[PDB]
Amino acid sequence: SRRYDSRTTIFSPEGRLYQVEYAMEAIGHAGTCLGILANDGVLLAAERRNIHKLLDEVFFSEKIYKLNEDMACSVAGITSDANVLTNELRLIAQRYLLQYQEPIPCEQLVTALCDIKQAYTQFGGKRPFGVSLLYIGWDKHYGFQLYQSDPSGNYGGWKATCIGNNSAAAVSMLKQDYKEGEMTLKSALALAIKVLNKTMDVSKLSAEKVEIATLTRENGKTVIRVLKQKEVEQLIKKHEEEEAKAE
Amino acid sequence: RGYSFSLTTFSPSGKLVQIEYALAAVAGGAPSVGIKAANGVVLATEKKQKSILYDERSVHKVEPITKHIGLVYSGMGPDYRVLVHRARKLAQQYYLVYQEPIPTAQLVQRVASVMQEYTQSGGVRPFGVSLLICGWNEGRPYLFQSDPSGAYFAWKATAMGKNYVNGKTFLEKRYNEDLELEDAIHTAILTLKESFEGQMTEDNIEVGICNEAGFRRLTPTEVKDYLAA
Amino acid sequence: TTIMAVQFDGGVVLGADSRTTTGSYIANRVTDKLTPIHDRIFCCRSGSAADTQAVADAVTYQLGFHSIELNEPPLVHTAASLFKEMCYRYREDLMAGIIIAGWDPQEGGQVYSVPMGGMMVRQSFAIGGSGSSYIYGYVDATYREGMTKEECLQFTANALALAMERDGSSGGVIRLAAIAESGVERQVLLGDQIPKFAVATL
Amino acid sequence: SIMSYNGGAVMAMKGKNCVAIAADRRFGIQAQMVTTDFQKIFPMGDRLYIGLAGLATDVQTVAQRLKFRLNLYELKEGRQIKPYTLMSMVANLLYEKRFGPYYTEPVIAGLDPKTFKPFICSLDLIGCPMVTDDFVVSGTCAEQMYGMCESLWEPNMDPDHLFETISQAMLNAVDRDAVSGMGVIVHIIEKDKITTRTLKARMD
Amino acid sequence: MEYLIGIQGPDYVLVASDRVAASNIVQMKDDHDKMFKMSEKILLLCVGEAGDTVQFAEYIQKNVQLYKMRNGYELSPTAAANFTRRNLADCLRSRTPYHVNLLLAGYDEHEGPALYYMDYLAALAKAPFAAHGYGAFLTLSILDRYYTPTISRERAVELLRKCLEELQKRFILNLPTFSVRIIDKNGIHDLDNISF
Amino acid sequence: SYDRAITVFSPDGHLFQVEYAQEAVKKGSTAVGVRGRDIVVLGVEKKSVAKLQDERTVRKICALDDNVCMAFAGLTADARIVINRARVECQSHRLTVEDPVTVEYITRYIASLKQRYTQSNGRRPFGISALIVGFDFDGTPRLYQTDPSGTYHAWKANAIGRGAKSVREFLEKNYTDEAIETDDLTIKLVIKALLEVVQSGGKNIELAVMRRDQSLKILNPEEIEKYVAEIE
Amino acid sequence: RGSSAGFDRHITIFSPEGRLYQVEYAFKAINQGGLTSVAVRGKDCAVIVTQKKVPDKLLDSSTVTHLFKITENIGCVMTGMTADSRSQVQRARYEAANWKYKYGYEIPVDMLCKRIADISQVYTQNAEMRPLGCCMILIGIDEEQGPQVYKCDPAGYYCGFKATAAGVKQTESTSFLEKKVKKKFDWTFEQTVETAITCLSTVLSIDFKPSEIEVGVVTVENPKFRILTEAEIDAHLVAL
Amino acid sequence: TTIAGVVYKDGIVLGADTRATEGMVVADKNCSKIHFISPNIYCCGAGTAADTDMTTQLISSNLELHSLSTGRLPRVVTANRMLKQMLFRYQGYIGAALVLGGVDVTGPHLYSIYPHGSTDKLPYVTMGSGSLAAMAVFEDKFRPDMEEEEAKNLVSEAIAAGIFNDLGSGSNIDLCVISKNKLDFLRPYTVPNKKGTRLGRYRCEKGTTAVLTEKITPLE
Numbered sequence A: 001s002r003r004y005d006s007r008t009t010i011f012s013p014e015g016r017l018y019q020v021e022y023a024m025e026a027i028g029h030a031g032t033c034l035g036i037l038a039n040d041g042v043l044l045a046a047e048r049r050n051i052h053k054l055l056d057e058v059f060f061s062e063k064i065y066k067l068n069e070d071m072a073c074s075v076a077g078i079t080s081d082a083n084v085l086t087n088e089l090r091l092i093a094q095r096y097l098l099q100y101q102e103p104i105p106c107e108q109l110v111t112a113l114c115d116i117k118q119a120y121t122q123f124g125g126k127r128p129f130g131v132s133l134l135y136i137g138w139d140k141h142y143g144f145q146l147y148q149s150d151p152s153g154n155y156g157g158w159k160a161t162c163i164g165n166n167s168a169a170a171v172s173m174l175k176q177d178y179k180e181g182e183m184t185l186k187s188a189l190a191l192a193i194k195v196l197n198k199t200m201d202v203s204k205l206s207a208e209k210v211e212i213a214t215l216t217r218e219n220g221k222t223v224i225r226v227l228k229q230k231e232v233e234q235l236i237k238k239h240e241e242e243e244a245k246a247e
Numbered sequence B: 001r002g003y004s005f006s007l008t009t010f011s012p013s014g015k016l017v018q019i020e021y022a023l024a025a026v027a028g029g030a031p032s033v034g035i036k037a038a039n040g041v042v043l044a045t046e047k048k049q050k051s052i053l054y055d056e057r058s059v060h061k062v063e064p065i066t067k068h069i070g071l072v073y074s075g076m077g078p079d080y081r082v083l084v085h086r087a088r089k090l091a092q093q094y095y096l097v098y099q100e101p102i103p104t105a106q107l108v109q110r111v112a113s114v115m116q117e118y119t120q121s122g123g124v125r126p127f128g129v130s131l132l133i134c135g136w137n138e139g140r141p142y143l144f145q146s147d148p149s150g151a152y153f154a155w156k157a158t159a160m161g162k163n164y165v166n167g168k169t170f171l172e173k174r175y176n177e178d179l180e181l182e183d184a185i186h187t188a189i190l191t192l193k194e195s196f197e198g199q200m201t202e203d204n205i206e207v208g209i210c211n212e213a214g215f216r217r218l219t220p221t222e223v224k225d226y227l228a229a
Numbered sequence C: 001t002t003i004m005a006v007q008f009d010g011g012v013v014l015g016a017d018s019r020t021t022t023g024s025y026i027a028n029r030v031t032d033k034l035t036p037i038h039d040r041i042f043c044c045r046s047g048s049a050a051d052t053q054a055v056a057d058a059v060t061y062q063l064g065f066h067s068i069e070l071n072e073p074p075l076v077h078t079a080a081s082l083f084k085e086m087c088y089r090y091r092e093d094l095m096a097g098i099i100i101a102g103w104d105p106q107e108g109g110q111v112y113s114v115p116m117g118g119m120m121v122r123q124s125f126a127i128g129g130s131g132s133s134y135i136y137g138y139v140d141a142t143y144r145e146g147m148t149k150e151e152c153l154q155f156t157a158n159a160l161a162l163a164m165e166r167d168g169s170s171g172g173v174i175r176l177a178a179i180a181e182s183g184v185e186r187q188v189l190l191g192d193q194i195p196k197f198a199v200a201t202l
Numbered sequence D: 001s002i003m004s005y006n007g008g009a010v011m012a013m014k015g016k017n018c019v020a021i022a023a024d025r026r027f028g029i030q031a032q033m034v035t036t037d038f039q040k041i042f043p044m045g046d047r048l049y050i051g052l053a054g055l056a057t058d059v060q061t062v063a064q065r066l067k068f069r070l071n072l073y074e075l076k077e078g079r080q081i082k083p084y085t086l087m088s089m090v091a092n093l094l095y096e097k098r099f100g101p102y103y104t105e106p107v108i109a110g111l112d113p114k115t116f117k118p119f120i121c122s123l124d125l126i127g128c129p130m131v132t133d134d135f136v137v138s139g140t141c142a143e144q145m146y147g148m149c150e151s152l153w154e155p156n157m158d159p160d161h162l163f164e165t166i167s168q169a170m171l172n173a174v175d176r177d178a179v180s181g182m183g184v185i186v187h188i189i190e191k192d193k194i195t196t197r198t199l200k201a202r203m204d
Numbered sequence E: 001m002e003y004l005i006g007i008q009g010p011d012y013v014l015v016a017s018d019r020v021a022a023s024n025i026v027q028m029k030d031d032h033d034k035m036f037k038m039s040e041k042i043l044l045l046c047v048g049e050a051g052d053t054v055q056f057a058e059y060i061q062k063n064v065q066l067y068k069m070r071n072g073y074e075l076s077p078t079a080a081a082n083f084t085r086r087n088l089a090d091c092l093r094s095r096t097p098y099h100v101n102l103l104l105a106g107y108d109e110h111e112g113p114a115l116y117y118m119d120y121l122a123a124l125a126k127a128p129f130a131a132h133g134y135g136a137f138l139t140l141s142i143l144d145r146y147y148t149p150t151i152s153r154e155r156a157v158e159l160l161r162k163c164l165e166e167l168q169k170r171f172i173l174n175l176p177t178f179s180v181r182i183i184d185k186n187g188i189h190d191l192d193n194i195s196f
Numbered sequence F: 001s002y003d004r005a006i007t008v009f010s011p012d013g014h015l016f017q018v019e020y021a022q023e024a025v026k027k028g029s030t031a032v033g034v035r036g037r038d039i040v041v042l043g044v045e046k047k048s049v050a051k052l053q054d055e056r057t058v059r060k061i062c063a064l065d066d067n068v069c070m071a072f073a074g075l076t077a078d079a080r081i082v083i084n085r086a087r088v089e090c091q092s093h094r095l096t097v098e099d100p101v102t103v104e105y106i107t108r109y110i111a112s113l114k115q116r117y118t119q120s121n122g123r124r125p126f127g128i129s130a131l132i133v134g135f136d137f138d139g140t141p142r143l144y145q146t147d148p149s150g151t152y153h154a155w156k157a158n159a160i161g162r163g164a165k166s167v168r169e170f171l172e173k174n175y176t177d178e179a180i181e182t183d184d185l186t187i188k189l190v191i192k193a194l195l196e197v198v199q200s201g202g203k204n205i206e207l208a209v210m211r212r213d214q215s216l217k218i219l220n221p222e223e224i225e226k227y228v229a230e231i232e
Numbered sequence G: 001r002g003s004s005a006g007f008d009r010h011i012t013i014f015s016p017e018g019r020l021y022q023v024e025y026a027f028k029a030i031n032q033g034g035l036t037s038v039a040v041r042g043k044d045c046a047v048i049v050t051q052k053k054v055p056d057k058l059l060d061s062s063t064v065t066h067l068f069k070i071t072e073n074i075g076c077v078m079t080g081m082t083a084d085s086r087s088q089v090q091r092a093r094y095e096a097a098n099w100k101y102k103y104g105y106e107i108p109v110d111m112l113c114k115r116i117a118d119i120s121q122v123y124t125q126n127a128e129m130r131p132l133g134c135c136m137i138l139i140g141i142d143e144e145q146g147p148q149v150y151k152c153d154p155a156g157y158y159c160g161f162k163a164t165a166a167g168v169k170q171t172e173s174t175s176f177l178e179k180k181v182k183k184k185f186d187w188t189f190e191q192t193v194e195t196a197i198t199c200l201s202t203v204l205s206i207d208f209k210p211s212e213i214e215v216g217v218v219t220v221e222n223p224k225f226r227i228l229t230e231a232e233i234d235a236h237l238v239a240l
Numbered sequence H: 001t002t003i004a005g006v007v008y009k010d011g012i013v014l015g016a017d018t019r020a021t022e023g024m025v026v027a028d029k030n031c032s033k034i035h036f037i038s039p040n041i042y043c044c045g046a047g048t049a050a051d052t053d054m055t056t057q058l059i060s061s062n063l064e065l066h067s068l069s070t071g072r073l074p075r076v077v078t079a080n081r082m083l084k085q086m087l088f089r090y091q092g093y094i095g096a097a098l099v100l101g102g103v104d105v106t107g108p109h110l111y112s113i114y115p116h117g118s119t120d121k122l123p124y125v126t127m128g129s130g131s132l133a134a135m136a137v138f139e140d141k142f143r144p145d146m147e148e149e150e151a152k153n154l155v156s157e158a159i160a161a162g163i164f165n166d167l168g169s170g171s172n173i174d175l176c177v178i179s180k181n182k183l184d185f186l187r188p189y190t191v192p193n194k195k196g197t198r199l200g201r202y203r204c205e206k207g208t209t210a211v212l213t214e215k216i217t218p219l220e
């Protein structure tokens, strides 16, 4: 019916896609996802929002997903919409592996998903996916990479970026304290903790509100690991000591 | 034919009002409580009929999904029945392929996926129900919640429906990680009693327990004994 | 197989043998080939066991739904028509010869024959099956107009007994059913109860 | 005939807390040998292998499709598949084409990722599981493999004895088969190590 | 039947094919090219039923070129071989199967030279050397006798000539000339035809 | 299947959805292109380096085929879709015609694709305008521009996106046979035209060239700086 | 409490409080008929009694009825819009017949009520169509559970009752039946029919004539659904 | 293949051998041919092993869904109806010969479903290659309303006849007793045939096999 139609996929009089813009607005109200690229590898650091005392942690991670043997991603926005896209990413990666018998390059996987998102914004009459993603991976063409995709379907490679709450503040800080080409995994982790500490206003980084995953190459095989509670606590303790000494 | 445009869209502030309104229907629903014990899970809910005419045993609220999974809800009953049917089908499809009972987490993900489709598909409203799923897989109890939006969480103890905020506060003070199933049942009943607003009988509440033996719905005789104690 | 149906003033009489074969092996020697389509409508099944059972169930579902919609008992002609429509449409795939006999208020006892190919015709009496070829002369010689229910039962029992004797695909026991306004009376003849005809001695 | 078009032989055996899976290396089109390093045993996990025999094209297609499904399952479930579950997944895959099936008869061998219990099984070309506690064979020389395995197999064999028994069974079975042979590869799966060996075999 | 052959060396792949297109009993063409340039370092050699060879080879060529244009880098020989095998296997059980026997030769910057054998059933295999056609029954033994892994490209051409000469002496079909190409780290080089 | 008529006429005969798509193109980054005697040049005004963004993945100049390349101005996601469709068409034309496409042919294909989206059910017009440059088999350089409405034309020099009107006025006054006399002079003209719109200049511009029988070449940042210094 | 946004009073979508106003309006469409129906359950019998209004003598009273036979052992009384009721009765007949064909035994009353409720729930979730403005009450004898009485509604909610009612005077009948049920529940067949008739007469404030109501019963001895004749109704009316 | 079923006084006794052949060679020496349909219904399978497994599994799944929805125990007639209707739809291409038996609210019921979709409700049935041998024992010794022990002995003897008189049947005998308040699943009920003891030792001593290449991959 014409009357009840919302007309999601149409242009505004100013040449703007309102549903896309509103979806990006929903992204800003989600947890903070951080991604940093280093010579040794890549890491993803995210702020955990399900911090209730009665929640049980039984899953692999709250916001870190393994898309492939050598790739991973983090999400920000609608949790249910993120679950749909994570499944599509895993299907896309495996379809490429079946066809070519070689792991999908990271850029190709991001482009494939971003084509799905763009289609929803152009035709179909349905609301766009209100989720933004960060990808980390390794491939034989470009080595370690880090990508970010938005609901609009756009994407781009980054050396360090942040999505979610206080993304603008995190980006300005990473711009200040990122050493292009001279970063290591140890230094990247310290920077991630420092940025998360400042971006998570009204918090003290209790180590239950942050999940950190690192991607590295060991003996020719990609290794994706989620830092344990003890490791995160040690990182926070070191950051506290450094801040105290800086006085 | 049917409408092919989504009825749930993004507000200028960046929210899905229909999902928010769906959650409002859940909050107005009847109280439901779930507790994860050390060696089992207990689902309890308030089944209060409007008159003595209603047959208490006619329709149940704590329905089994498989030999080891249970389900309780808070919200609209008709929508609960739809999800109960889909959950049973998904459990059977998994068993056919893998010849093994579906793990509790996998069932929750599939059911949550169905809920997600209804909040994005065209010409349909979201489910006005929130589910509580209990299971026992790999010698371990499981408890999950599934919101109308298709998002699910793993809980040690939670409450839904009317007065759920107060119920959750009660659970936090009273819940202990090291609990036997019998102790958990007492706490679940007490949590319901905190906002029952009436006199509680085995015919006014429904209780289900999941443990190694599987999932079963406690008979009214058993509920009578627990209420007495 | 041997199925027979006779019509008398007031109702019909149905009969059949009780043999089902898979070559030269008798898979079932007490099979019941008289299927109640409705309260006062029966069908005698011959040919493929699977095809006849599937079609009989389909017609039973159709006729029952039809009867409920129209608050009246079904017509035997309607039962035959549904059988004809199915058998004619799927004549390539089906191998089933059906005799539809029953009683309804409008027309009384009726017998309809639906052989392979989907033909339908009403007859005073009908025979069919593998063994029916051996009693065409007997029924044509011994049939008389205006028989009674008792005479029809004896007529059907004698005809089946002869066919079962001379046919390797027919045997076991004779199952009889008489349908009238009062109801359905089912009978089974076995052992010495089956009519006997002495053999020669050269 | 279609099964013997390319030839091939696979056998799996059970020991004490260990399993062995063996296959021949020949790849040929009817009587002509094309390559003597063809892969038939594929790794489905740390201690889980599947050996496929039959049409070479179907051997590669089934292995690739199985890995496609197994990879998705592991990511979804966040756990390693159990040997029994893999057998069911293979059976479901094979039976999906009951009319026009894949011409291969997989045999699975591995240890359960939790208790490391030995497991072996076979499947028909349409997905009929068969779990045994002694051994399984599949290929053009099935009759020869049965004769050797039946007479040589013993219960509760150490990894060293297991390797000798399966190798002897494979060598003497292919030696009496024309379109199978040209080398034998044996994997011994233990709790903490995988030992892959290539045997000295007749190449005629 | 058309003839294909490929020899893989330490850092090169040598491929040759006949140049005959015969309808029933008359050679309609004496300079036919059976080699398809998949990319700057991959060659596909196709022989089989008329129409199937060109349609399958050209279809794969377009897809490989499209992958290069889309992603900015070319497919590896291994990826191209598996991609070709997937398409052939998928069409095998369909209503329009392709009856083509293939030889894929290519050079990879990291892995190095690669030669792949694929029959019309879509069974992929990697071999140091391979041949297709009825001549394969007659030249393969020669390759087995004289081939070594460390064979120089000069000795490879001599070994190729040995196989072609054997075809002239003992084969019944008239295959006067052959097309010869070599793939190395510098790309695809067209050598002089071996004619008789 | 959603089958509403997104684009419809309005009084005075205007397709507002098409007009709104053009407004999206105007809000896009500036792109320039000139047709030289033996070289075709494409320049794009980079929005910002951002100091942390991989410039390799944000390129606004793409190669449809060996002999054809294009630059766009509008929605980035829409441009990626049109680029993939054009690339597939180029390979298909190669397959069934055994020759490379012509710049006019692929421009016509893209133009038809955009027009079909403005007169179809359940979809909105594309929000990009593209400049397509290349060399035909005859060797004649070509430069075409396509609008979201599906119209296309052949240009000797044009600009699209933000500041298109100002850049086009600059190009009209300072385009001549002498200006395009040499390949280096042609490149400087593109840079000078871009500098008329982009403020910082030099750093915030991406430039690519395509010579006869040669693949697309992207000028390095050092090369752009040398040209910028020479212009100054 | 009564807030609204978008089209929530026009299509079946949630209101700011999550209320489904369209479903609520469908419930209120049941009273447009102006009739009331009552169903009671006894020890070994189930009875459904409904009003029978014949506006004019020109109408053929034999065709103006609200008791329908679904199967030989299941009967129903429909309240609400006539056209919607007839369509629902037709769907129930199809579902019962289909169940028997597929599973080989007669559909239980509760299962039939469930399927109709599931069909109704779809109309509430999908915005293309509107809910049916009718209510169905089903009665039958279960092989193990004895007499059964079930009620569906436009929202897709169903339940089993000892006694229930629908229509204009549903609330008054429920209060009347609740008082009666609180006492002993011996409820012989005569008592059940008398209880159903007296309830309807009391709430409607009228002394029924033999040709002003319809009565359908199922008994354990005679499970087949039966519609009492005018003479049989008169005998019950005279006794009470 | 010898699968047999008998209806005795209190319930049903199902029997089956344990042998599958691929051609004329014994593939599996111990196969479970008595499948589980529901807690009160079981089904013996004969014919194509994959078809019987898929058919019983699918119907068991559908019945379990049916039982959950209704809340009552499933009925043998419902299982029989589901099986025949699917088999008929496949026109006999699913080579599943089945002996369906269970005890429900209406008492014991024993069926026999054929691949083409024809069923027969009988007090005793047999299917498979050794079906005729089993039926000989049933026709010779069957009596109505037999005791449980007598019924078990009869079905065991019937399966034994097929084992020893059919080349497609052998190994152990399986039984399944279904009653109103009991279900005994005697998997190895009897073991008539056993492999002979090995008289000589052929153990391959270490080093008796020559190896060209070896590779060890330790696992964490």
Ligand SMILES: CC(C)C[C@@H](C=O)NC(=O)[C@H](CC(C)C)NC(=O)[C@H](CC(C)C)NC(=O)OCc1ccccc1
Pocket: C001, C002, C019, C020, C021, C022, C023, C027, C028, C031, C033, C045, C046, C047, C048, C049, C050, C052, C129, H092, H114, H115, H116, H118
């Ligand atoms: C009316 C019924 C009693 C059916 C009966 C008629 O007398 N039909 C028959 O007796 C015919 C005779 C045949 C020569 C056509 N036989 C049949 O219909 C038989 C009966 C089965 C129980 C094995 N059906 C048949 O051959 O197909 C089923 C089948 C499928 C696979 C293997 C063996 C048998």
Ligand SMILES: CC(C)C[C@@H](C=O)NC(=O)[C@H](CC(C)C)NC(=O)[C@H](CC(C)C)NC(=O)OCc1ccccc1
Pocket: D124, D125, D126, D128, D130, H001, H019, H020, H021, H022, H023, H027, H028, H031, H033, H045, H046, H047, H048, H049, H050, H052, H053, H128
């Ligand atoms: C579960 C039972 C059916 C097991 C057993 C009992 O009869 N079946 C069998 O022994 C039958 C014999 C056949 C001649 C009917 N064999 C089989 O079903 C065997 C599987 C065994 C290796 C376990 N299947 C087999 O060889 O497949 C051949 C085939 C291929 C395509 C379609 C149908 C059949």
